[PDB]
Amino acid sequence: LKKYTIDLTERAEQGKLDPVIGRDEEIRRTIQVLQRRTKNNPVLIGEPGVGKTAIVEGLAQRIINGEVPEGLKGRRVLALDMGALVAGAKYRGEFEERLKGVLNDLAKQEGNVILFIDALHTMAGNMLKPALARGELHCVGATTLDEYRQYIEKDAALERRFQKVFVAEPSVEDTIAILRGLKERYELHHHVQITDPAIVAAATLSHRYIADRQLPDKAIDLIDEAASSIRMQIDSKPEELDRLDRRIIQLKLEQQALMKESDEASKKRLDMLNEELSDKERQYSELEEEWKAEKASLSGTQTIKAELEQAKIAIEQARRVGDLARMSELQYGKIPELEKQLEAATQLEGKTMRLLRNKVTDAEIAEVLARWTGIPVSRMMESEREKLLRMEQELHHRVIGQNEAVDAVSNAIRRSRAGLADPNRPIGSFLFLGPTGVGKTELCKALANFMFDSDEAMVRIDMSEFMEKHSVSRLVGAPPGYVGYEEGGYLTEAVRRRPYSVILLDAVEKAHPDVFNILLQVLDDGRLTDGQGRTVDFRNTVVIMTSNLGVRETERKSIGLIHQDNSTDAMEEIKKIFRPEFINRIDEVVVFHPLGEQHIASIAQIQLKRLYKRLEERGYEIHISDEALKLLSENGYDPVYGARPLKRAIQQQIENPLAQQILSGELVPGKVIRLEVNEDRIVAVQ
Amino acid sequence: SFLFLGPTGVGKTELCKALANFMFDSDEAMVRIDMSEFMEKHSVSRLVGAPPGYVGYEEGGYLTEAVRRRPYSVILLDAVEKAHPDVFNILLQVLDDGRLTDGQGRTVDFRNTVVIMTSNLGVRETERKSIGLIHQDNSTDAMEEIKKIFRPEFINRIDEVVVFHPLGEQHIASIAQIQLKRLYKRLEERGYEIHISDEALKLLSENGYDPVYGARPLKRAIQQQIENPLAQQILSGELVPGKVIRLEVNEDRIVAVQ
Amino acid sequence: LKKYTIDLTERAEQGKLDPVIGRDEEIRRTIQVLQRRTKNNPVLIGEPGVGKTAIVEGLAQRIINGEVPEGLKGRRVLALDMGALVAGAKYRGEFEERLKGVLNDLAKQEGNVILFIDALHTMAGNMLKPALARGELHCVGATTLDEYRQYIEKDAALER
Amino acid sequence: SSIRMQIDSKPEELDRLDRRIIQLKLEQQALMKESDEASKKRLDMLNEELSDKERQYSELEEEWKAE
Ligand SMILES: Nc1ncnc2c1ncn2[C@@H]1O[C@H](COP(=O)(O)OP(=O)(O)OP(O)(O)=S)[C@@H](O)[C@H]1O
Ligand SMILES: Nc1ncnc2c1ncn2[C@@H]1O[C@H](COP(=O)(O)OP(=O)(O)OP(O)(O)=S)[C@@H](O)[C@H]1O
Ligand SMILES: Nc1ncnc2c1ncn2[C@@H]1O[C@H](COP(=O)(O)OP(=O)(O)OP(O)(O)=S)[C@@H](O)[C@H]1O
Ligand SMILES: Nc1ncnc2c1ncn2[C@@H]1O[C@H](COP(=O)(O)OP(=O)(O)OP(O)(O)=S)[C@@H](O)[C@H]1O
């Protein structure tokens, strides 16, 4: 006991531990395990962070407070580790005799002292089971499920001496009370305020968006992180002081470099920069002056906070000794007087200046969790309003036509930023049923290039690969008994990388209806469980389907066949598999339409922009006759095909004599090329 | 052991979640499993675990794991057309006797745990055959796909075969005013309130209805009709918090007004 | 420390280390996670092409240049060798006899060091969990993506 | 073991009445402390409720002792 153990009760006696609120039936349950005749030793099972070690802690706190039931009053709790154990036993019999010696140390401890084991699934086996049988080994363990089972579930005393107690992830409100317990502890370490919408929004959004770590733990390190952020901000200077300090240090290192001169006053023709340099000195004294003012304010605030807690630990040690009149004149007396005038003074300090930031606040929490996912609230103060309010203009840079479609998509993303969508659904559930040659993939690339500013994050998946049973085994993963079980799937791993992004599907109809049903999982609800064995949240990505159910009837429907009927044999495979919650609870069947003249001329222009971009990389510039654009616009159109073979007319009419002459060396860089229809076709000229 | 058949329109797993929030006070504990994952041969190696010596053995299948953790729960089964007949017969060891072994080497109790199967064999044909199909005849063409694998051991050893039915329009009014409430929670998130006329709510009633499609154009008819201009006026900075919105109808498209 | 580990800050002071350009939000993010009171243990994830141990050594460059915010300027950084610890694994029992004494030395510098760990999926382990639990051991890890996937993602203390 | 706990623990009339008397002792500790004795020492109702709950608490206390 000299070497191997740590008294928890004494570290409680220094108040080093932190209080734990609740779980009362768990505590009575465990004490019921403790003062039994046999099976004296309980098991705590759950997830990590749920508070198993902290349940042991607050138990020991209740013991040193004397609030324990009788018999246990005075009985001590010590935690035994490994690591002091596993010292230099290179030869046989050493470690065994250590453990035997501390078992006899327990024997002369006469049943008084409760032992604790953390990480029961570490640990012998022979040496404990009779002492376990007698009840002499009076211990407590803690682990998770799989560590328990795969440790072993099935050793005779190692199940027989022990009893399982489920902790579980508690409610929102319980964790709220926990944060109400620990908020003062973290104002001690973290020197700032605590706002109530910060903690209730922290519990709510941590419950919504983090899908791996549990309450309370995710709210806890939300608080620890954000308070760390505010100390990080206040510890440094504000960025106006920093960049304005950069021009201050820039100019004083400019003349500081320029003091070493032949005749310094002669080459000081820059006398106004000497004067304005003294202005940087004075202005710097202003910024540092307000800076030390704010440091005096919040520094004094941190002192009276910590000294206030010294009054509180003082009054609790006074609760241990019980001198009621002194306690009543202190906590009913001198301390809350200085508290309320102290808060009037510190709110006067909070309103006396502006660069001070003392609250937590909930918006900071929204920025942190927003940084883990990608959905902020803080763009509202930012210049989101421009690019959001020209979202139709932004997409109508690189997609002409179909205003209905871009308005539909745009309104969906706008109400996603509003927060109006069902949290228990995916955001976007889209179906584009239009003709060919219309720029579906243009729209998808436009949107990925809108948010994530590339066409990387757009997760393209062909569905024409898929006909058979094995298709879902492709995208989802393999069952166990196969190497692909160790591997996993495309999709599950893919959104498990980055949560909230774009998922793209192409010619969706050809697959099996099994595909469509697991779509109906992730579109009715937005969850899917992999073959590996874990649920995957989809509920804040956007899925997009452009396809060809309707297309072989879309090419004959326009105009004259009704959108109900191509909605119907489009709805052939659909109502074959999908139900009213799908079609009524997807976003839209989006219809497209063919193009006219200025469509084709416009996409000729923005098509040419990339050509000017690449030749602009190569040092060439091109001027084009309007008539050449007229002939190309004459060439590109065909009704059955739409916008596509315009590109063919571009490359074969333009690019081939251009390629011949550009490798001919006739064309010299720096001299801007001109394009003339000095033919029946387009010719090139310098 | 209940099977849920007929048309849909109705929120079958919504009723399941009503039980999950009923007795377990949340929809978390209600373990849900798709059958349309499970059409393969290899599906059993997903749900029950692996045979010895191979990849995935010492980890087990999460069904027996979840039941063996907390014994007496509610197990959700879904869209049962798409499964495999062995899973039907492993399931026949479920409904008979309430016990089931794994690949790992032991059995798991079921005998105080409810299994619920939402399925579509009705709504695969009943919303098509809306004239003349009775509960017995729906059991017959149910027993087209059903009768081969599912036998009177299966079909007798399920408890009750609950058929459903389409929706009254006042029901749809009830669902709509249900769906308003969480939107009012979104308003109390931001400090707002919607008033509505009776008549604009009547517009949502006359728009949301579809006989074949049940009530289910309701919510997307709602937020598609009203939340898009709402999101415009909010994201504009136009709409001030601390105020009341009324759903007026400047004309037959519903408009939100401060 | 002295027995096994290597001072990176000393190498930056001797100019042996390479500068980096940009990424101020990420190194600020790391500082932000280092100002935790507990679990104060950030992990870098990416390919080896993304150069993250260059990021931590350029962080050490910022520390020596004092452009780190305050409080950390008293601290110094060392990186851990696995091999000189683990190479004496002849019998069953000897490695932890080294490792616990190492942990006591970390308890002897008393929070004035900031530990770096590389190849976190290689990193024993049960003894690490309490010191990382309390936030006593103030360490920094960095590793690869599917190394973290075959680490185990649902491994109990280690996610936490 | 559990019924032995419920015996050895303090009973529910004893502990509920203990909470009510201890709230009445802390409220009494704030009420005997006067800012205006002629105003704050109007407290007669709190002190007769004090003696009342000392009667009830003391009697159930004594019955608990005898059992
Ligand atoms: N109810 C609670 N009240 C206060 N703090 C809590 C509570 N639950 C969890 N915590 C915190 O969560 C931390 C981790 O939980 P533990 O007590 O270690 O139990 P755990 O679930 O075994 O986690 P481990 O030790 O990683 S397996 C504790 O140290 C507390 O700081
Ligand atoms: N409105 C448009 N704006 C710009 N380019 C367009 C437009 N319509 C078609 N295109 C061009 O046509 C090409 C093919 O269109 P896509 O973007 O692939 O969509 P699509 O017409 O439906 O054909 P898919 O993708 O095979 S279904 C694009 O790469 C563009 O070069
Ligand atoms: N009659 C109804 N009453 C209440 N909610 C309903 C009703 N009909 C549909 N819903 C809603 O519809 C959504 C999904 O209902 P579900 O429970 O999935 O119906 P379902 O029959 O289970 O469909 P599946 O899962 O494709 S078999 C939820 O938001 C329900 O609240
Ligand atoms: N922004 C950068 N600045 C400087 N060097 C960089 C940068 N990005 C990558 N590198 C270099 O990338 C190389 C490999 O990456 P490392 O920094 O060693 O860490 P890494 O990502 O783990 O790759 P490893 O070490 O091979 S596993 C190093 O030589 C770095 O110097």
Swiss-Prot record, chain A:
Other known facts: One peptide binds per ClpB hexamer; the binding site is formed only upon ATP-driven oligomerization.
MF annotations from Gene Ontology: ATP binding; ATP hydrolysis activity; identical protein binding
GO CC annotation terms, alphabetical: cytoplasm; cytosol; membrane
Positions of the UniProt region annotated as NBD1: 1-169
Annotated domain remarks: The Clp repeat (R) domain probably functions as a substrate-discriminating domain, recruiting aggregated proteins to the ClpB hexamer and/or stabilizing bound proteins. The NBD2 domain is responsible for oligomerization, whereas the NBD1 domain stabilizes the hexamer probably in an ATP-dependent manner. The movement of the coiled-coil domain is essential for ClpB ability to rescue proteins from an aggregated state, probably by pulling apart large aggregated proteins, which are bound between the coiled-coils motifs of adjacent ClpB subunits in the functional hexamer.
Main location group: cytoplasm
Stated family: Belongs to the ClpA/ClpB family.
Binding site residues for ATP 1: G46, E47, P48, G49, V50, G51, K52, T53
Full-length numbering of the shown residues: 161 to 857 of 857
UniProt-annotated location(s): Cytoplasm
Induction comment: By heat shock and other environmental stresses.
Protein name: Chaperone protein ClpB
Binding site for ATP 2: G434, P435, T436, G437, V438, G439, K440, T441
Top-level taxon of origin: Bacteria
Chain positions with N6-acetyllysine modification: K16, K469
Region (C-terminal) residue spans: 595-686
Keyword match Acetylation: yes
Subunit: Homohexamer. The oligomerization is ATP-dependent.
Keywords from the UniProt entry: Acetylation, ATP-binding, Chaperone, Coiled coil, Cytoplasm, Nucleotide-binding, Repeat, Stress response
Gene name of the encoded protein: clpB
Function: Part of a stress-induced multi-chaperone system, it is involved in the recovery of the cell from heat-induced damage, in cooperation with DnaK, DnaJ and GrpE. Acts before DnaK, in the processing of protein aggregates. Protein binding stimulates the ATPase activity; ATP hydrolysis unfolds the denatured protein aggregates, which probably helps expose new hydrophobic binding sites on the surface of ClpB-bound aggregates, contributing to the solubilization and refolding of denatured protein aggregates by DnaK.
Curated annotation (Swiss-Prot), chain B:
Misc note: One peptide binds per ClpB hexamer; the binding site is formed only upon ATP-driven oligomerization.
Species this protein is from: Escherichia coli (strain K12)
Family: Belongs to the ClpA/ClpB family.
Residues binding ATP 2: G6, P7, T8, G9, V10, G11, K12, T13
Swiss-Prot/TrEMBL induction comment: By heat shock and other environmental stresses.
Protein name: Chaperone protein ClpB
Location(s), subcellular: Cytoplasm
Function comment: Part of a stress-induced multi-chaperone system, it is involved in the recovery of the cell from heat-induced damage, in cooperation with DnaK, DnaJ and GrpE. Acts before DnaK, in the processing of protein aggregates. Protein binding stimulates the ATPase activity; ATP hydrolysis unfolds the denatured protein aggregates, which probably helps expose new hydrophobic binding sites on the surface of ClpB-bound aggregates, contributing to the solubilization and refolding of denatured protein aggregates by DnaK.
Note on domains (UniProt): The Clp repeat (R) domain probably functions as a substrate-discriminating domain, recruiting aggregated proteins to the ClpB hexamer and/or stabilizing bound proteins. The NBD2 domain is responsible for oligomerization, whereas the NBD1 domain stabilizes the hexamer probably in an ATP-dependent manner. The movement of the coiled-coil domain is essential for ClpB ability to rescue proteins from an aggregated state, probably by pulling apart large aggregated proteins, which are bound between the coiled-coils motifs of adjacent ClpB subunits in the functional hexamer.
Origin superkingdom: Bacteria
Residues of the whole record sequence present: 600 to 857 of 857
Species classification: Bacteria, Pseudomonadati, Pseudomonadota, Gammaproteobacteria, Enterobacterales
N6-acetyllysine PTM positions: K41
Subunit structure: Homohexamer. The oligomerization is ATP-dependent.
Gene field: clpB
Annotated region described as C-terminal, given as residue ranges: 167-258
Ranges for region NBD2: 1-166
Transmembrane segments annotated in the record for this chain: none
